[PDB]
């Protein structure tokens, strides 16, 4: 049954570190396996580096090529002793999702699988220590919160950057859309992956910026110059696997060439890209030019920038984004003389924690923005949905139009990830931001005679600048974060549409634990994305401040008939989280450009001026509770 | 009995990390304890930093103050609960070494107490992992040697720098001569501690230089300028106490001010010292001037430079040497914002491993050298011992005049230091340099009618330079390493004096393991120096090369009557290792300046010209075996 | 030219007048300015590696070589041996030599002014290659011999990708193989890379019969003493690579001259003739190698023999 299948998968995931020791007399028998084992087990695996992705692609394709599920389990089992734990938890995990007769099927928790990435060196330590200190079945609980001197104001952001859910999501997203993805081999293609790459990262930056403003900090600035020295960050993460940890980065580093790539190359790549935008065409390998069409342009750019296998010219355009992660990651030891592990930037699970991440991503976002700039603005025609008027919006909470945010304690179970020994469970306690539940009530007047179908789009943007209160829509575009997107039908006359925050399309409703999975639930029967992907729920709104920071609440209704695509896909599957994740094996459900209406330049000085009749702005307050 | 006493001490030393959790309702009861407990438990303890040293001193005093041994155990037991563990080990070891009541007693092994400092992050992790992986009484053995790509040639030196014995010695030496040492409080004074400070460190540098030359590398250069960027070093040590590890140092940034101290603070202190040398006087607090006497000068300088409590002016002169360790140690995070642990430079146990250590110490050595320069050279009168002539010297080994050096495997038992759990023992296997045993035969002609008493001094110096073969005695002075010093009586006529390498005054004959100590032997019962201090035996001669590098073997005989001091001290106690360690509670047994005849400038172009009749040079070869 | 410029040449010029870029001080340029002197400056290598890199990127764009391209079927290389005083060891030493100044600088009264200098040199050696010709008929093969260092800067690692940069060409020559086992012996003196002899002014005033062609005559070719690297006293280990290829494929047809300056074909080419080898210069080394060890790369018509080079002080 499916349940049995789930059980088999969970053990593929257990004791990965330990699983090493090949115990294989000969790989030759495993002809399928020949293409791998090239990266040694203990070594850190880089999500960004090309070679690490070459070997990884080869693992995927063999586990897609494995004939049936049983065959799948077998090959998977053999090669995670020989082909290394670090890369093989990657080549298995991504494969584990996508090859067909797998379905039913969650992946064990990333946080749970590698607790060391989620929690600090100290609370890893203490817990391991307690296990040894007194042998006893009794459970161990450790509070990760610590006590320390809070020197850097960046620390304030830690609730966002360090959040477990955020890191997990980032890991999962890359799994759903792998850079290595080869559509020919799989046969299936990921719709608009390049564009999604752009959108997801942009949102992370946008959301990040809202945190800084909530904090009273200015918006992050891009890593526009390569010459500039980076700010330091020390992760305090250990790798349980070995004694090694992610190397910390001191202050004040100018950029160093790596054997693999030189900084100059990075510059040269970026200048090409920025030029190809201006030129409005890119050059394919064939030396043909493809236009940066309005429809296609973002996607093509996304593939080139990341860059994915899909890039029209890998050789000329290079892979700017990925190399950025690599270069930043080994700033400490570019040359590799000193033999130190890379920083957090190397891993999709960890990278969000470093503040540098935002600087780089804003830089890349800028590239996309230049392209967007080339496009013409939106006419009333494009925006408006005639006959529909938005009367008002209200947010209901304990106090209307105010959302309250607080910190909540939570526990993570280490036992699946690290050797438990005698103890039944070792849990680490951490705290994260959370907010009260709320609902939206939108009153819409349907002037038309017949029932209409509308897509409701809701975004949140900070009212205040660093100067003083200034709702300049051009700037707002960067800041706006997507709260929700959903379909509703309106009858003629007045209508009130109520939606609850829980329903939010952006967030993951729930991630099942190992324990949940061993059980066997029906939420439904899905994938690496299953409970994993989606933005985390606690994270839905920015922290705000004790004072109650003012944010613009924007609701827009668009014609659904226009917005939806027609086609024939599946049952109700992982679609909760469509806004950032997309739909399983389906085309992106919205015709509009991701981020619409915000994606293109806004002529108006004030946001209010921008509004059409099917748009509305309600100012609400977010107040944090200490 | 003494044995019982030993047993009590060993547990003071066990599970130090764990010993935390105060379990004290109130410190107020412990009035004695009020002074200590500022430094937090987990934090790293700095041997160099003044504030840390102050706490440590406060702790020792309480231990010294303890009325009886039982009282000593009690306060220690209680103090260990609150105080930082590193400080605790430091304070206790000092107490054990000096306090009479402890006429019983070795200190548990430093390597054994903190195995994590001696062995790498990987083999620490491995033995811990194996312990958890399969529970079983069975013993675990891990080979620390690894497999890696050898990028830096500095790696070649690792046998010397990384050596367990060397690190242990350095720890112990600082314990015997603490910087904090206050003679008034103890009542007793450490004879010539300032000079010894100078001599010991100079020897470490000199010995280090011989390794580089054996390697074919040039001699180390001093940290002559503070502006210059440092070479990076990654220790790969994870401090078992914590999940944190010693922070690695990447390549190249000029020096950063710490909150505690500035760089123009540092520089100023250096100019003061170098000035006062030139002026031939230093200024006391009283604003009186004390002359840099020939007899006293090195000692006074040593106290000021280190600087010890003994410094005649702490505020004017500062503490250059110690601050150097601190500044280098937290180069990665001067400001303390990023909250990272210090590097190896912070600890006496670890500091030798970093190559920077030598650069700094040569710098300080230079300071001493300038002082030495001010002194006049030695006349034939001072050097010569009339009537005595040295006919020849021969070294006996498998092949005469050739010493063979090889690598030997050894194991270290982790169990005392880290939580063992079920396993009986976890041992880590490491390799170290070692040499064949050899003896010296010196033929001396005693022209005089009566029997004479002579001190035989033996040194080794490299023949080859970085250019070609050039025995320029001035340069040689830096390089010469002390093999042995001993007293012999010569009758009239020809005499042959034979001495074995094992007897060497420079080296520690044996360090007893916590296991041996678990029983009860009879080397006798003195303390932290016991088996600990002394230079390690395997280390006695430089590695040399496969080719058989040529070294000058220098033997000099001096009039013992002149050399010895008269006084009334103890039974045969820790005197094996007199050359570098001194004698327990005794005045340094040799009148001559440490390093004599090498300490003062040599006029001659060639070493041979320097020789008097009671001196001799024999060229021998050291050949390494792969 | 107006777009792509002249990068290499300008590099020499710029480096040469680093001391006085302005030409205000009216200094002379450094050694980099002259083809005769430029090799002496260590900078030369840095720049040339830079330019070499440019070529390498181009080479990178090309696909690797299949077994098909490399292999010469029916031919198998059994073994190679180098004969010297001690087999498989080449000895290198320093030799004194004299140069006569008189033609170059005003001699005045003196008959001759000679300056004595020392240079590296090695003992003569020969190669013996055993090849099995499986085919029924006689074949024609081009024997290609290269030398590459075994040791890296770290430890012993015959990573063929890296080796490509290091490999130096010892010799290229044509041999005919009959069916059955064959032993081909070649002497170092014959090496295609080196100039057999440069005649002095004195030699020339005389009148000899190597033949009469020109600036390349005795001049060009790599110098003979230079043929192998110095090695070390310990006897450094080098990979000796021999490959045989189908000559019919390798040669071009055409109608050119008598036996002329062709001794030194490997680096010099042939006088007024097309380059005699179809293969890319540096083949098989020019394109990227996937293999882990060099050994994996080998086809049946290739062979590696490890020899030692030991310098004599």
UniProtKB/Swiss-Prot annotation, chains A, B:
Keywords from the UniProt entry: Copper, Disulfide bond, Metal-binding, Oxygen transport, Phosphoprotein, Secreted, Transport
Modified residues (Phosphoserine): 374
PTM remark: Three disulfide bonds are present.
Protein name: Hemocyanin AA6 chain
Miscellaneous field: The two copper ions bound each have 3 nitrogen ligands (presumably contributed by His residues) and share a bridging ligand (possibly contributed by a Tyr residue) in addition to binding oxygen.
Assembly notes: Scorpion hemocyanin is a 24-chain polymer with 8 different chains identified, assembled in hexameric substructures.
Organism taxonomic ancestry: Eukaryota, Metazoa, Ecdysozoa, Arthropoda, Chelicerata
Annotated residues for binding of Cu cation 1: 170, 174, 201
Biological source species: Androctonus australis (Sahara scorpion)
The keyword Chaperone belongs to this UniProt entry's keyword annotation: no
Major place of residence: secreted
């Amino acid at each position: 049954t499916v349940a049995d299948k789930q059980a088999r998968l969970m053990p593929l995931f257990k004791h990965l570190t330990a699983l090493t020791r090949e115990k294989l007399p000969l790989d030759q028998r495993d002809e399928r396996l020949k293409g791998v084992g090239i990266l040694p087990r203990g070594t850190l695996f880089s999500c960004f580096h090309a070679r690490h992705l070459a070997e990884a692609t080869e693992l995927y394709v063999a586990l897609y090529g494995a004939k049936d599920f049983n065959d799948f389990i077998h090959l998977c089992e053999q090669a995670r002793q020989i082909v290394n734990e670090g890369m093989f938890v990657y080549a298995v995990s991504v494969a584990v999702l996508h090859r067909e007769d797998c379905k039913g099927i969650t992946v064990p928790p990333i946080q749970e699988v590698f607790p060391d990435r989620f929690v600090p060196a100290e609370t890893i330590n203490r817990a391991n220590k307690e296990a040894s200190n007194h042998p006893d079945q009794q459970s161990i609980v450790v509070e990760a919160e610590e006590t320390g001197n809070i020197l850097d104001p960046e620390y304030k952001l830690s609730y966002f950057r360090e959040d477990i859910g955020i890191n997990a999501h980032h890991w999962h997203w890359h799994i759903v859309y792998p850079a290595t993805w080869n559509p020919t081999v799989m046969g299936k293609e990921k719709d608009r992956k390049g564009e999604l790459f752009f959108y997801m990262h942009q949102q992370m930056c946008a959301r990040y910026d809202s945190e800084r403003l909530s904090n009273g900090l200015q918006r992050m600035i891009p890593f526009h110059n390569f010459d500039e020295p980076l700010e330091g960050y020390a992760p305090h993460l250990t790798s349980l696997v070995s004694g090694l940890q992610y190397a910390s980065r001191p202050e004040g580093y100018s950029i160093h060439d790596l054997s693999d790539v030189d900084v100059q190359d990075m510059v040269r790549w970026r200048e090409r890209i920025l030029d190809a935008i201006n030129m409005h065409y890119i050059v394919d390998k064939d030396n043909n030019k493809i236009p940066l069409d309005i429809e296609h342009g973002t996607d093509i750019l996304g593939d080139i920038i990341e860059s994915s296998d899909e890039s029209k010219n890998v050789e000329y355009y290079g892979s700017l984004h990925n190399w950025g992660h690599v270069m930043m990651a080994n700033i400490t030891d570019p040359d590799h003389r000193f033999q130190e592990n890379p920083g957090v930037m190397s891993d999709t699970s960890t990278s969000l924690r470093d503040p540098i991440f935002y600087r780089w991503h804003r830089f890349i976002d800028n590239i996309f923005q230049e392209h967007k700039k080339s496009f013409h603005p939106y006419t009333k025609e494009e925006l408006s949905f005639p006959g529909v008027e938005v009367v008002g919006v209200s947010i209901n909470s304990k106090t209307a139009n105010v959302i309250t945010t607080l910190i909540k304690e939570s526990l993570l179970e280490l036992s699946h990830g690290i050797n438990f020994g005698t103890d039944q469970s070792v849990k680490v306690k951490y705290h994260h931001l959370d907010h009260e539940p709320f609902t939206y009530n939108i009153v819409v007047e349907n002037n038309s005679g017949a029932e209409k179908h509308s897509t409701v789009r809701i975004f949140l943007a900070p009212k205040y600048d660093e100067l003083n209160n200034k709702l300049e829509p051009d700037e707002q575009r960067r800041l706006f974060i997507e709260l929700d997107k959903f379909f509703y039908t309106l009858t003629p006359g007045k209508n009130t549409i109520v939606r609850n925050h829980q329903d939010s399309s952006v967030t993951i409703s729930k991630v099942r634990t190992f324990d949940q999975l061993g059980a066997g639930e029906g939420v439904s029967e899905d994938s690496t994305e299953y409970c994993s992907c989606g933005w985390p729920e606690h994270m839905l709104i920015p922290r705000g401040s004790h004072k109650g920071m003012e944010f613009e609440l924007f609701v827009m209704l668009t014609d659904h008939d226009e917005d939806t695509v027609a086609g024939l896909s599946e049952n109700a599957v992982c679609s909760d989280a469509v806004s950032y994740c997309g739909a399983r094996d389906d085309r992106y459900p919205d015709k509009k450009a991701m981020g619409f209406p915000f994606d293109r330049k806004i002529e108006a000085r004030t946001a209010a001026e921008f509004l059409t009749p099917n748009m509305g702005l309600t100012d609400i307050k977010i107040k944090f509770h200490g």
